[PDB]
RNA sequence: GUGAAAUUCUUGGACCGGCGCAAGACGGACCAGAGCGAAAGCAUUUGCCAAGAAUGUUUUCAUUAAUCAAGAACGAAAGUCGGAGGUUCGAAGACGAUCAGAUACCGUCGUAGUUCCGACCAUAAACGAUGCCGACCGGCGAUGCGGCGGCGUUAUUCCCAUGACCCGCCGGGCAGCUUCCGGGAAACCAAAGUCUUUGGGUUCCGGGGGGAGUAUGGUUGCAAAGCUGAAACUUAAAGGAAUUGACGG
């Protein structure tokens, strides 16, 4: 990928885990 | 010119110099001895001055202070001191 | 590697150059980097400047010139071609190609 | 020492009323109940008495101001724009 | 022109305008024959001034910071 | 006019008709598009000024004035730029003697002034001392206020 | 360089090698001495006092005619000024600028310059509570320093 | 350039020249006739400034409008409080032309 | 309007031409390998307010300095909050085209935004991918500012001053050309030189490629996120500069 895109992937990512650990 | 003789340069070149990148350093200013028009006394003037110089026996200006010399008023006359 | 040592531009003791737009396609272009055009044409074509001056009502009469500046991309600066590429060491040089008068 | 970490002044309305609107009301109240310069006798002691109506302790002057201000910004160009059409009227 | 010959209007002053504002400067492909056709139909020609707008400065071109990519 | 220039244009709006003769009145003027495009090169810096001035008549104006600097027959520099303070200067001349040929005479005696643009032509004269100036015009003049259209002023200003 | 500034001047005074006075100076050690008290009465700074010195009476040097600088003559007699000449210029200066700025809140480059002022200020003190010029608790404050300069 | 002239020569009328901070004394000083320039704050009171400016004709002595108010004017003096009024007995530094 | 179209607007006068009005943006050409600013950045006129480099100085103080963990100020754009304003452009969205498909490139419309005021955020290929201070080491022609000296031309005036040119010198800048100074893997660099002939002072910082700027902890933020920041495991290369060939809608 783009590094650009991977690292909007990654903050994506980030976001949906800290949500699942916020619910907890 | 790997010979240039840095011990004597002519005062050509020691005139060209920058004040402080002479051999020895010498300022470009001096003083000057000024003669009011109608006046019979004379005011030592620095070359560079920065205030206007005026004579205590008449209410007239002798120079006015510039970015590099005090320009002379119009029928005063000067002389160096001592070179 | 470094292609160009004013890194195609003329941006030297600067920090920001204000954009323009490129009248082909409507880029950003930084202004010292678009490539520009001052084109004076007569307004009239050279075969028609006998046609308008037979119609005209006055004798001595000075066409009219046509006075634009045209900015461009590089992109379409070399589609265009009013820009082509250059050899590693012509294109080193500045001088603008000769207007051949004769 | 130091008493509250950000809510300051409205440490008194507690954990009601949700945390934006306090920070909004938090300026507002600061401003409200401070004590301006009075520009008449020179002293600070120019404070609201109700909303828009603004005291001086020392000199007993009452000048019409803003709601939580002593002037508002609004007011202050309006005077600088009313001195320049008068101005501009007047030659 | 034969529209103009016919209602009684003999010379014309020539206005050349392209798109202008934010758009372009030049003058379209049509200016050319327009004003040559004019000339060749016997109408007398007078000035000629281009009236393209210019703006001072206009309001942002369309087309985004990236252009009209083709 | 028999033999002026031809890039200088007038608006002249008409106020009044009367049988079959419209009657115009100076409304404006500006030079040319293809003179202004010419007169503007570039290694060279061009000073604009405006001033709103009233006439005698009561006729308000905006006039627009542009000038440019002259490089020397002898120089060898690329560039002709004027400072700032220069600048200023000379759009303060241009601008106090672009009032004083308003202020004092009517309408009728601006516009046959400005027909050969003598405005233009002293200022470029007075000029000289802080930069020179070449292609000094009044560019443009347009009419921002009008008093009350006196039929008879009308009538003066076209027979006698 | 500048302390403060990218720039890299060389504009300086060359004083000359001769440090003997002129044969054509009249002046006196106490001519010359009387002329900067009744300066100083005036009110000048010791740089204005060798600027008018130099400029109109044609003296090249007070140390040089004298045997002592300007400010060494002025504590002796006991007119010195209580700040240093330049500690007093500073603090003028960022009175000023405070009080442009706070008219001006947007004016983020007067509070840079204000910032490299006041940093100024702070060094230059810490250099005269050293060398025991000013009191050793001598604080500059921002609020009082405004009654101590003009 | 005459705000930062007042406020230097004002500076050197303290430490250097008898003065007198105050509506009663500077009052005092006039009927005294002694007082030679009084600074009036424009913060000050319309009806004080009025009869000051009275009582400085009477006693033919100059009247100077400061550009500040009170609080500006004593921090001119260099003085931590307000200063409405003031009055010079004599400047020792040509704020006062002989 | 486009490659071609179409969505769309149009006998209700659309487009076009003319005269006005209103609004909000934007300050073309002049505009440059030009200037200023610590950077970000800064371009209509005029006034006010403070600030500043360079220059000139036979002024003053006399080492007051350089770099700097912690800490602090500012910090494009986007984004967030509150209030105004909203012309144009235009994320999202809708539609028309194109296409095998087309959530796109192209076209029409259009929300947030783009504008101003106040408060956050602290990130950019925030670049010279190049720390600051100091010294030395080639040539040349220019340019900007200041100063100095000179044949002359020009502006008025009666002459010098003072401007505009011309010829030089000096200092501080933006740079450029050239060179077997020298360096470098080379591209190239008068600095990226004065380095095995290795030491001027000082700050930050890298240790094969991935995992990974990830997990976790802490801390900052309204949020988006920012700062600090692993390990398991995996891999024999990944990369840089140049050469030849092949290929290029
Ligand atoms: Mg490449
Ligand atoms: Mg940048
Ligand atoms: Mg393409
Ligand atoms: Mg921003
Ligand atoms: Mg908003
Ligand atoms: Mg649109
Ligand atoms: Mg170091
Ligand atoms: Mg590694
Ligand atoms: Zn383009
Ligand atoms: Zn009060």
């Given at each position: ?11 994506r ?8 650990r916020?619910?907890? | 010119?790997?010979?240039k ?5 002519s ?5 060209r ?22 006046c019979?006394?004379?005011?030592t003037?620095?070359?560079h001055?920065?205030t206007?110089?005026?004579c ?11 970015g590099?010399?005090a320009?002379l008023?119009?029928?005063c006359?000067?002389?160096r001191?001592?070179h | 590697?470094?292609?160009?040592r ?15 737009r490129?009248?082909n396609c ?8 678009a490539?520009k055009?001052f084109?004076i044409?007569?307004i ?6 006998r046609?308008?001056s037979?119609?005209?009502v ?9 006075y634009?500046?045209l900015?461009?991309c590089v992109?379409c600066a ?10 590693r ?6 001088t603008?190609?000769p207007r051949?008068?004769? | ?7 300051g002044?409205?440490?008194?309305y ?6 934006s609107?306090?920070?909004m ?7 409200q109940?401070?004590?301006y310069?009075?520009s008449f006798?020179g002293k600070?002691?120019?404070?609201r ?8 302790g020392?000199?007993?002057?009452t ?13 202050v160009?309006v005077?600088?724009?009313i001195?320049?059409?008068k101005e501009?009227?007047?030659? | 022109?034969?529209?103009?010959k ?6 014309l ?14 003058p379209?492909p049509?200016?050319?024959?327009a ?9 007398k020609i007078?000035?000629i001034?281009?009236?393209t ?8 071109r369309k ?8 | ?39 503007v090169?570039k290694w ?11 006439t ?8 627009f004035?542009?000038?440019?600097t ?18 200023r200067q ?26 050969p643009?003598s405005?233009?032509?002293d ?7 802080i ?19 006196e ?9 006698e | ?7 890299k001047?060389?504009?300086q ?9 002129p ?6 050690s ?5 002329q900067?008290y ?14 008018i010195?130099r ?6 040097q ?14 002796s007699?006991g ?25 001006n809140?947007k004016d ?6 204000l ?16 060398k025991?010029?000013?009191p ?10 405004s009654?101590?300069?003009? | 350039?005459?705000?930062?002239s007042?406020?230097?020569r004002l ?5 250097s020249?008898?003065?007198?901070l ?6 005092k000083?006039?009927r ?8 009036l ?5 319309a009806?004080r ?6 009582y ?22 260099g003085?931590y409080?307000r ?11 040509s704020?006062?032309?002989?």
């Amino acid at each position: 990928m783009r590094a650009k895109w991977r690292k909007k992937r990654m903050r994506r990512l980030k976001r949906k885990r800290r949500k699942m650990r916020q619910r907890s | 010119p790997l010979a240039k003789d840095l011990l004597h340069p002519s005062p050509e070149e020691e005139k060209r110099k920058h004040k402080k990148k002479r051999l020895v350093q010498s300022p470009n200013s001096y003083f000057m001895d000024v003669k009011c028009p109608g006046c019979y006394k004379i005011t030592t003037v620095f070359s560079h001055a920065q205030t206007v110089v005026l004579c205590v026996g008449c209410s007239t200006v002798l120079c006015q202070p510039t970015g590099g010399k005090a320009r002379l008023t119009e029928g005063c006359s000067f002389r160096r001191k001592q070179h | 590697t470094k292609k160009r040592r004013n890194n195609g531009r003329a941006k030297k003791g600067r920090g920001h150059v204000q954009p323009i737009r490129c009248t082909n396609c409507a880029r950003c272009v930084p202004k010292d980097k678009a490539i520009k055009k001052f084109v004076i044409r007569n307004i009239v074509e050279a075969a028609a400047v006998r046609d308008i001056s037979e119609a005209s009502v006055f004798d001595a009469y000075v066409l009219p010139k046509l006075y634009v500046k045209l900015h461009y991309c590089v992109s379409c600066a070399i589609h265009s071609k009013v820009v082509r590429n250059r050899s590693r060491e012509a294109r080193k040089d500045r001088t603008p190609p000769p207007r051949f008068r004769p | 020492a130091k008493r509250t970490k950000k809510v300051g002044i409205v440490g008194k309305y507690g954990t009601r009323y949700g945390a934006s609107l306090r920070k909004m009301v938090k300026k507002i109240e600061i401003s409200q109940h401070a004590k301006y310069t009075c520009s008449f006798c020179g002293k600070t002691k120019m404070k609201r008495r109700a909303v828009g109506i603004w005291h001086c302790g020392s000199c007993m002057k009452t000048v019409a101001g803003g709601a939580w201000t002593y002037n508002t910004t609004s007011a202050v160009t309006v005077k600088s724009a009313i001195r320049r059409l008068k101005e501009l009227k007047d030659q | 022109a034969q529209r103009c010959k016919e209602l009684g209007i003999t010379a014309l002053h020539i206005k050349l305008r392209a798109t202008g504002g934010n758009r372009t400067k030049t003058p379209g492909p049509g200016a050319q024959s327009a004003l040559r056709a004019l000339a060749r139909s016997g109408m007398k020609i007078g000035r000629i001034e281009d009236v393209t707008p210019i703006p001072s400065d206009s309001t942002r071109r369309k087309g985004g910071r990236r252009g009209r990519r083709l | 006019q028999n033999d002026e220039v031809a890039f200088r244009k007038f608006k002249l709006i008409t106020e009044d008709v009367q049988g079959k003769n419209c009657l115009t009145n100076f409304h404006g003027m500006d030079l040319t598009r293809d003179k202004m495009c010419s007169m503007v090169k570039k290694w060279q810096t061009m000073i604009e000024a405006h001033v709103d001035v009233k006439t005698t008549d009561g006729y308000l104006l905006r006039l627009f004035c542009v000038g440019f600097t002259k490089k020397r027959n002898n120089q060898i520099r690329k560039t002709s730029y004027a400072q700032h303070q220069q600048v200023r200067q000379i759009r303060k001349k241009m601008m106090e003697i672009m009032t004083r040929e308003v202020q004092t005479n009517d309408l009728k005696e601006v516009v046959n002034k400005l027909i050969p643009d003598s405005i233009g032509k002293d200022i470029e004269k007075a000029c000289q001392s802080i930069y020179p100036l070449h292609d000094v015009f009044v560019r443009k003049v347009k009419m921002l206020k009008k008093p009350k259209f006196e039929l008879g002023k009308l009538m003066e200003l076209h027979g006698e | 360089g500048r302390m403060h500034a990218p720039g890299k001047g060389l504009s300086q005074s060359a004083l000359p090698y001769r440090r003997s006075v002129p044969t054509w100076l009249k002046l006196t050690s106490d001519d010359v001495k009387e002329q900067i008290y009744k300066l100083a009465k005036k009110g000048l700074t010791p740089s204005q006092i060798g600027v008018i010195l130099r400029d109109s009476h044609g003296v090249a040097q007070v140390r040089f005619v004298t045997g002592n600088k300007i400010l060494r003559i002025l504590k002796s007699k006991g007119l010195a000024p209580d700040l240093p000449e330049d500690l007093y210029h500073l603090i003028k200066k960022a009175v000023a600028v405070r009080k442009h700025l706070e008219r001006n809140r947007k004016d983020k480059d007067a509070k840079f310059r204000l910032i490299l002022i006041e940093s100024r200020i702070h060094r230059l003190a810490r250099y005269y509570k050293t060398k025991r010029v000013l009191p050793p608790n001598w604080k500059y404050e921002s609020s009082t320093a405004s009654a101590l300069v003009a | 350039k005459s705000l930062e002239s007042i406020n230097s020569r004002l500076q050197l009328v303290m430490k250097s020249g008898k003065y007198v901070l105050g509506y009663k004394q500077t009052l005092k000083m006039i009927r005294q006739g002694k007082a030679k320039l009084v600074i009036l704050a424009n913060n000050c009171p319309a009806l004080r400034k009025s009869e000051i400016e009275y009582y400085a004709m009477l006693a033919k002595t100059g009247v100077h409008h400061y550009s500040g108010n009170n609080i500006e004017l004593g921090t001119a003096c260099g003085k931590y409080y307000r200063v409405c009024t003031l009055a010079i007995i004599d400047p020792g530094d040509s704020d006062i032309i002989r």
